[PDB]
Amino acid sequence: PGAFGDIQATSLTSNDLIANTDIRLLKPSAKNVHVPYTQAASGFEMWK
Amino acid sequence: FEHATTVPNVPRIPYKALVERAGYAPLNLEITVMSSELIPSTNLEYVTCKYTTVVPSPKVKCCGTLECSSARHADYNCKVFGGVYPENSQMSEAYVEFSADCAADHAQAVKVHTAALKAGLRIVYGNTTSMLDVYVNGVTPGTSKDLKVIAGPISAAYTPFDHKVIIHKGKVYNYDFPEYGAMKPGAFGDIQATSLTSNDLIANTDIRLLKPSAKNVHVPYTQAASGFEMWKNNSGRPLQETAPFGCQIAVNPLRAVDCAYGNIPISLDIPNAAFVRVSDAPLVTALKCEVGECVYSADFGGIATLQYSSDREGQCSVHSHSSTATLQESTVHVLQKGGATIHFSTASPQANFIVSLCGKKTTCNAECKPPADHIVNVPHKNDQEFQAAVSQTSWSWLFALFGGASSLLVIGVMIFACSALLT
Amino acid sequence: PLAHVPQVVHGFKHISLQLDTDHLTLLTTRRLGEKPEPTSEWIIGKTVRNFSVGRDGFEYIWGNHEPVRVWAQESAPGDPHGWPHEIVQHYYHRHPVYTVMILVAATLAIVLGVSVASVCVCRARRECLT
Ligand SMILES: CCCCCCCCCCCCCCCCCC
């Protein structure tokens, strides 16, 4: 994660996507309904 | 009965000991230090904030003159500038005071003397636990319901603090604030005050009044930043985050909670109705020990099996006698024929220790293997030792090499005596 | 804000923690021994930090989470129960300021013993031979 090649697919339209992103869900704690998370950045953008 | 040992001061590591007197079954004893803080005796010199200088509406005579001296206030610069506002005169006195709010954001330049030690000891003896708290000086008896505990003087005294300290909102800084009444401007301690509410501010502020030049009435002053405001930028890391034994510092009375240093000597005074005679403890004959895993160094890397033979169904009480292994759970519900297990916890490559089940002492010989886990959430429950952290095979190699480096010398001095006394 | 929980790699006598944020967080450490040796830094972006943990080691915190403590163990590559090329790889890799010392002392003891034996047996062939 956080490097080049985080998402992977064998064409632009094929299935079987493959992904590490260090996504971590978190416990909601608020008055209204939300689903919180945290995540590593897009490692294709950190190559450009 | 009276027993005396030396607990090590690392909090929430339990410590096993047997107390045994004659004609009585040896009962167990665990003494876990659950909290420990040293409290020093403190007294505060002064109190600082930012000035919000009273910048009053100035005093201006159109044709008359002003000669304004000082009222009982702080730093002024009660300066009386001449020909201005086209003689006329303005006596501007921008005197400092406290800010609009120091009940929320101030500082307490506290001085600190030598400190104490409490503890929060939890002692389990027999079937009863006891929560107490005892001053770590060799005299004061912290007592439970029935046992009297004293705790000796510390091996080596230690302070995370220093002589001079500063308390901000919540945090603590080892900084060298200037004395009372002898301050310098620009730095910390411009305003001094013995409290928030009292009178008698003493200021050296580097306030500088300037002669006005404008079409309208104002009063121009320049100043440095308040030394409090500039200390809020110049300060490094509090003592919460650089304290030298992992201790954490919470302050209403400025204590240093949960240090880890030295070792307390305890000296307990056990009641007399917890013991039980050997005419009521089960006997035990003929122990043996298979020894299993023995991954050393970690937490509880050891298994063994005690193979025993008793008379009744009671509870015995297990304790390792050497120091290079320290077991766990300290009591065993034995039976007549049985084999219940233990948990050695060495930190040396030779499990070579001595176990007594209910009084019958046997040994455990083994060989320990290094762990395959590099970094772990739990502190070490032993300390290393020379002549015990060196494996047996390496002793065989060292004695072989260094003793073969000397047996030929013994043969050489026999050559001396033989060749010199026969001739 | 709570920062994005880092990712640790436990080596021999150190940790390495890949960190990835985008607003500046504050990484603070200390060692829990006698010499604390503190360290503080602001980081952005994506970086990797290495920190040598000892036997009494290393509490780090990172960007207003609760702190986290870490203790190191006495691993090494080798065995103290084996051939002499597997034991010295276990001790010199853990205490290099002792292993070389005892090796030098042992070899000098061998050289001393064989030298005095070699000179005294030649003395014995001399003085017992008129
Ligand atoms: C700080 C306390 C010291 C306790 C550990 C001391 C370890 C000494 C280790 C010396 C290494 C001896 C290895 C020698 C191997 C001989 C094989 C020929």
Author numbering:
A (entry chain a): 197 to 244
B (entry chain Z): 1 to 86, 99 to 435
C (entry chain d): 234 to 363
What did the original publication write about this model?
Alphaviruses are enveloped, single-stranded RNA viruses with a diameter of ~700 Å. The T = 4 icosahedral symmetry alphaviruses comprises 80 trimer, including 60 quasi-three-fold symmetry trimers as well as 20 icosahedral three-fold symmetry trimers. Each trimer is composed of three E1/E2 heterodimers. The E2 protein is responsible for host cell receptor recognition.
The resolutions of the envelope glycoprotein and capsid core were determined to 3.5 and 4.7 Å by gold standard Fourier Shell Correlations (FSC), respectively. The atomic model of the glycoproteins was built ab-initially. This model includes proteins E1, E2, and E3. Our analysis showed that in each E1–E2–E3 molecule, four N-linked glycosylation sites are present, namely N139, N245 on E1, N283 on E2 and N14 on E3. Two types of trimer-trimer interactions, the interactions between a quasi-three-fold trimer and an icosahedral three-fold trimer (type I) and the interactions between two neighboring quasi-three-fold trimers (type II), are observed in this structure. The interactions exhibit a quasi-two-fold symmetry with the third region located at the quasi-two-fold axis. This region is mainly formed by the interactions between two completely conserved histidines (E1 H125) from the adjacent trimers. Above the kink region, a hydrophobic pocket is formed by E2 subdomain D, E1 and E2 TM helices. A 20 Å long linear molecule parallel to the viral membrane is sitting inside this pocket. The molecule stabilizes the pocket by forming several hydrophobic interactions with the surrounding proteins, among which, the interactions involve amino acids W409 and Y324, which are conserved in all mosquito-borne alphaviruses. The interactions include several hydrogen bonds centered on a crucial hydrogen bond between the side chains of E2 H314 of the subdomain D loop and E1 S403 of the E1 TM. A candidate of the pocket factor is the hydrophobic phospholipid tail, which is fitted well into the linear density.
